[PDB]
Amino acid sequence: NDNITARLDRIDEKLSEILGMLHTLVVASAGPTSARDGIRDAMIGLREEMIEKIRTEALMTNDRLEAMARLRNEESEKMAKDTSDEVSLNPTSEKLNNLLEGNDSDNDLSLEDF
Amino acid sequence: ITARLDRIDEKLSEILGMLHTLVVASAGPTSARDGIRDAMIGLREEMIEKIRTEALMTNDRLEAMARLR
Amino acid sequence: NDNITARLDRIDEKLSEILGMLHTLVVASAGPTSARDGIRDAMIGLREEMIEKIRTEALMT
Amino acid sequence: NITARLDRIDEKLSEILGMLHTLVVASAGPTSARDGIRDAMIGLREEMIEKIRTEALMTNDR
Amino acid sequence: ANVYLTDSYLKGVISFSECNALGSYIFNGPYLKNDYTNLISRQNPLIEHMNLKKLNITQSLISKYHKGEIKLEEPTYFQSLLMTYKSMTSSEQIATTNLLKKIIRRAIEISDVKVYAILNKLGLKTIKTTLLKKLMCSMQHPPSWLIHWFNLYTKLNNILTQYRSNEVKNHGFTLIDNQTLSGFQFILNQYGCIVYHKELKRITVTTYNQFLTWKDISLSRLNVCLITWISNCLNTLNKSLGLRCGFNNVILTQLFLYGDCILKLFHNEGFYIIKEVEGFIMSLILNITEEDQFRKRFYNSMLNNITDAANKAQKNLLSRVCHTLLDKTVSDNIINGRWIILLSKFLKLIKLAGDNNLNNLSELYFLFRIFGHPMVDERQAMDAVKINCNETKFYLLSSLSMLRGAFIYRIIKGFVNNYNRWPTLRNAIVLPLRWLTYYKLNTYPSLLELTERDLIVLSGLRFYREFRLPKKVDLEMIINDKAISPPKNLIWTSFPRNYMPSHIQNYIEHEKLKFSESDKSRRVLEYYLRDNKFNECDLYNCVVNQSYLNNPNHVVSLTGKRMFAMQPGMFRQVQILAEKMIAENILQFFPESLNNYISKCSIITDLSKFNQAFRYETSCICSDVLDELHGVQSLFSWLHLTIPHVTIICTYRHAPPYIGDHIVDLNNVDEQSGLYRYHMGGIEGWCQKLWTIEAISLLDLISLKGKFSITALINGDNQSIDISKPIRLMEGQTHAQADYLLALNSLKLLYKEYAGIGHKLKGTETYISRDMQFMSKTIQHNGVYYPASIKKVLRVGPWINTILDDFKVSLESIGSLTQELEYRGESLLCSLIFRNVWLYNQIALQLKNHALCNNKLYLDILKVLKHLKTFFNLDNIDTALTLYMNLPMLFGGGDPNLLYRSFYRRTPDFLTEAIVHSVFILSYYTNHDLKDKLQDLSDDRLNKFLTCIITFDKNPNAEFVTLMRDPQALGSERQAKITSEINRLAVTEVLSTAPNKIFSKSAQHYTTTEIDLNDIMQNIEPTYPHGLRVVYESLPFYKAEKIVNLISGTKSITNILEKTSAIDLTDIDRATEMMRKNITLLIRILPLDCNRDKREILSMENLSITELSKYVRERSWSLSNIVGVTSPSIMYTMDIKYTTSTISSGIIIEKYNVNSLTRGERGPTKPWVGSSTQEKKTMPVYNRQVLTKKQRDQIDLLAKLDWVYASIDNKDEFMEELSIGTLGLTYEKAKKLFPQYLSVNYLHRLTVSSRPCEFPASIPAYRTTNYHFDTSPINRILTEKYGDEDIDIVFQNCISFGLSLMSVVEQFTNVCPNRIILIPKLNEIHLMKPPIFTGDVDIHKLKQVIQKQHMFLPDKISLTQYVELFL
Ligand SMILES: COc1cc(C(=O)NC[C@](O)(c2cc(C(C)(C)O)c(F)c(-c3ccc(F)cc3)n2)C(F)(F)F)cc2cc(C)nnc12
């Protein structure tokens, strides 16, 4: 009698599908409505559904691109830089570092003329 | 009847249906919303019965302690 | 056997809890004024029901 | 092997219960409070019930 | 009939809006910003502003401005000009120089007395000390920079002093001057400050607080220069005497000047650049302590942080002064990007000051206060967070589930570990099987055998109530001295009437009539005092029925004080309670809330903006668990369920919103800068403990996912995450690389997991290190602590941290603050000299210019000095003062730092220490050798003194309550009175008329309660003040007293309910006489007739100071026997030897560190923290969780009484009345809850708030690791004498003393001795055995106290609560 086994396999498939949805389910936080006149509930939908709402700016979020990459479990350019092996300097910082390195009085600054 | 486990299959179908019903709810506005809220089971009474059952279960514990006074 | 039965019994109550939570979520996810007032009013009635049951038990003696 | 299969089933149900319960708690947010249904979603606790029992046992002088 | 006494130090914030409002009105146009503030201040100016504008001098300046003669600048411009005030005449230079020389000379002459005594006592041997004669020679010519800062400080201080004096005399007075500080014309008012510089044709307008800040800046810079100078001078003489750090004051002045240049070029926003300098210093430190990968990463991030801030400052500056009257004040250096040159120079100077020396680098943290404070743009700060709080967050359900799971996991782990059981579950059925086994067996898996799946499973659990909420309100947690936001409808009352629209003004008048007096109070204390409908269970009831949800009166008010948030009392109480419940019931589960190679790293995270990232969906998933544990719903989720539904408004007085016509309801006011709605929680300071424990739960989730161990610590708004992961070290891979890769791998995971809950982290907020801890602002390297002690004394000055310029308090404050230089800075002499400088100024120079008392206090000290001159046969007044400032404040002297504090921090007996102190001090004049036994010398100055201490007219009064309140009190007017005692009557007089019956009833019976309480233990023979303290603490009067003591510490007590900031003359006069009586106390204590010429002066031959002290205390209270308080002074009883004796007969302290100097080094031994031996007691088995903290404490107190007073012949009636009165249980029932003490002698074990629980050495803990101590030799001698019975000398202090003095010797010798032997004076040590408390307790009076103050009783244990204890 393998009918019980077959039934159990069907049970497993349904549980798999239910868990499939749950582990791919995204909860949007409760928040202000458009033209803020109230608060919408914490709408819940599937990963892709929430991503599309973010992509098309249906929901109000700041880091639109990051929210999408995060929900897709992808590494964004910003995250890669923030956690890079070596931190680069901003152009302003490059100049500052160049001034800081070499104490040769290259600053040539006159405070008396301020 | 070991095959009574078919009842699990029945419930899981309802469970998956409810899970679908829940998530598709967000698709209502601008797409699947012809009126305000489409047809759904809407059995708040079941929610209420679960609340009553739990609340009274808790009430029984509270009385169980009052009983010792 | 009894071990199988016991496991099946535990599954049934888990499924009941799952449906209970889903009923809560599906019902709550519907938020027109009528549904929400219906829930709140039901809770008022719930309080009253608990009160009447408690009063009744208090009168056994 | 039936019990073994049931145990995997039971674990998945437990995982499902975990996910759904968290969902219920998270779902019962500021708006559920606004409409007076947060308690319905979460459930009544001992102190609220004690208040109910207190009222029930003291609607008048009794 | 009242006065207004203004601040002498910045206590609040410098409001941008205030400065803008005032300046904008004066110059008829936008000043700092073009916003609503400048618009309204011109349309409808405040009277205070009109008064300044209408001055004849102001009008002259205004004309010059409009004629284009003078230009308008932002206050930071003037900050620079003031700080660069070099326009001193020769007479000014001379006068200030001579003043400074005098002060320095006197401070040294003063320190000479203690230094002499210390060197003599150690035996290391107008100025007698050779060391200080040498120092005086070095310090007789102050550097120009010190003079510069001193002069500026002096002048600014004189400007303010004149103002404050005149404001008290004439309310509304404005100080107009141009002579005190040449070139600068000031117009000062508490409502504004206008400054004009004539030669530069420049004018600026700021506020009173900015002026205070300028003074505080000059003071801070002065103290830095002064300390640096002193330290350098001391180090010149002996490298071990001064501070570990060593700065060139020339660099320090350049830093200061360059920092001001930055603020001059970058107006207000320039503070952003300064703020980021902390990163620069941290970088310099890391460049020393960290590996190349870690330090390089930080350094580059650090530079970006600074430059990004600088660029932001430029952007914001240019956008701000676009349409304002300051549009022409932007330097071309900003526009041309030359500011980067200024910045590079500034940073180089910092690097130079640091000199690659961690000792300097840590100290340089003073640079963040040294430049003052920014003007706070309250509206901008509002908008800055709004964007993060109106933001929609997205989460994977599995993320939220796992976090809730982790939270629960920790709760379960906690309960199993603490209560030996799982929490009760209302749905245990959710658990599979393996988990049911854990539940049934009350066990749990470790994280190493846990999976993510399991956390999801645990996230499905629900609980039954495990804890209990208090039914009655603890007024201690609720009552405070802070402001309270008014109800939403009365929110407009927060703004000046003139700044409100006429419709608002009318509506305010109408709305006030619909609110209670408690609602209109605007203050927390008054809120409750005015609540005539108040009852003890209002909060409980409100919580249970969720009355705070959807509450129409809820509003969130922000003020500049990092944007302090307030809400109406109702909500405040809930906020406080939720945090309290977490603090007492939950944090117990979160203790940190307070291969061939294992990789290690640390991630340091700034969580200050984390609060903003929380949402209901991320926080309340955990708080709901706490709701269930406490059987209450919505209590711990109150914030997110309420805040989103209210308007968040900046309520700073001068920063009103624009309100459209006919709009009254705040929630209908157009969103605008500084005002918005739909704030999705995250209010800083609220739910802080909740978020802390949530962070911990997340970390556990992270450690699980990352397969590594986390040892985290969270403190306030930041955390340190120590990560450890066993790995297989790869070929060619070194440990540093493995650790760096771990940090990166873990950092990526951490960022992902935090982002996974809606919290985005930034490289500006989070950084990594290998193995060094820089948390809590303490720099520790290789176990060595590198302090920032200068930062702690920057604000030391005349009337510091005192109310109504209370003289004695400010002396204590100076003492306490300057003590840090000794305790952290590890420089006894530097702290002493620095202290004496400011104490001198406070007593000798500023005392004659008191804001309230003029020179009355000064005239009184002169009487004291004349008195001392005669009493001690001194040569002059200067000498009398030299002595005065070295005498214990306990005796009416001027010394706030008793010598014992230089060796150990805590004593159980202040009197004995004060007596010894005086003996040591007087030896200076009597030439008594402190290395020997006290003996009668031809110089009777000491004998006269001691005679006067012991011989006096007895005058006991309410001795038992006095001892209860202060177990070390003396009575008979033999001690200085304090505000707590002096004002207590005034407080009760006010409270007795309060609308709130709880307070008025208590106050009305206060006197009678005190009397009944006094006559309670009056029949017990061997009076034990600490035992009395327990009795007192166990009674409701204790809580009543705490409220009184809280109130008694404020200003204008009699006007509390008068709704005014004015100070009543009654309070001024009482405080005046209080101070005068305390100043002249020394006269009363030491009469010229020695309290009787027929009383032979006390002979010191075979005199025991311990016994003398006991005698004095007993005489002063007219008691036959006082026990458990008197304790020998370790500093007196130990004779210090630096050799090997024939017989040890003492404590041997050895130097284990091989080096001759131990300062700045860690040794092989364990750190000494004193550590009093705990109580040895058997704990009864019951469900403690069934009880609240308050009633558990009550039980513990009663158990202590059962222990201590077991011997009273009325014990059963005593304990029965207490148990029934305070718990409701009978004694027999309560006894089953009481811990059973197995310790026979409570005299050195009983834990009370009046007794030190630790007796640490006056030294950094890291420094004690260089030493080893052996108390055996002495233990044997004592055992042979006392027969294994206890003695009254504190064991821990004996050790702590030795450890500290070994450091002191190093300081004075530049050589740390290899060993020190402490040989005790046995005649000073007495048997301390537990007494038999014969006599009964007055049960009637006991009942009376409990009844009269019944409203302050804790929750009683009901039968339904009691039965649950044993289930
Ligand atoms: C925690 O609070 C306190 C502690 C102690 C205290 O520690 N007393 C010493 C003790 O009784 C002992 C016994 C023996 C006996 C005679 C029993 O042998 C000793 F030898 C030594 C001892 C001495 C110095 C030394 F260097 C080595 C040993 N100490 C102690 F037990 F508590 F430690 C005295 C207090 C007095 C007051 C008034 N208030 N609080 C006190």
Residue numbers in the entry:
A (entry chain B): 128 to 241
B (entry chain E): 131 to 199
C (entry chain D): 128 to 188
D (entry chain C): 130 to 191
E (entry chain A): 10 to 134, 184 to 619, 627 to 659, 689 to 1461
Excerpt from the publication:
Single-particle cryo-electron microscopy (cryo-EM) analysis of RSV L + P in complex with JNJ-8003 resulted in a 3D reconstruction with a global resolution of 2.9 Å. Non-protein density was observed at the capping domain and was modeled as JNJ-8003. The amide group linker of JNJ-8003 intercalated with hydrogen bonds from the C = O of I1381 and NH of F1385. The fluoro-phenyl group interacted with F1385 with a T-shaped π-π stacking. The comparison of the ligand binding site from the JNJ-8003 bound and the Apo structures revealed notable side chain flips of F1385 and H1338. The side chains of F1385 and H1338 from the Apo structures produced steric clashes with the superimposed JNJ-8003 and had to reorganize to allow the observed binding mode. Our results show that JNJ-8003 directly contacts S1266 of the priming loop with a van-der-Waals interaction, potentially reducing the mobility of the priming loop.
The RSV polymerase complex is composed of the large protein (L), a multidomain protein having RNA-dependent RNA polymerase (RdRp), polyribonucleotidyl transferase (PRNTase) or capping, and methyltransferase (MTase) activities, and four phosphoproteins (P). The RdRp domain is essential for both transcription and replication of the viral RNA genome.
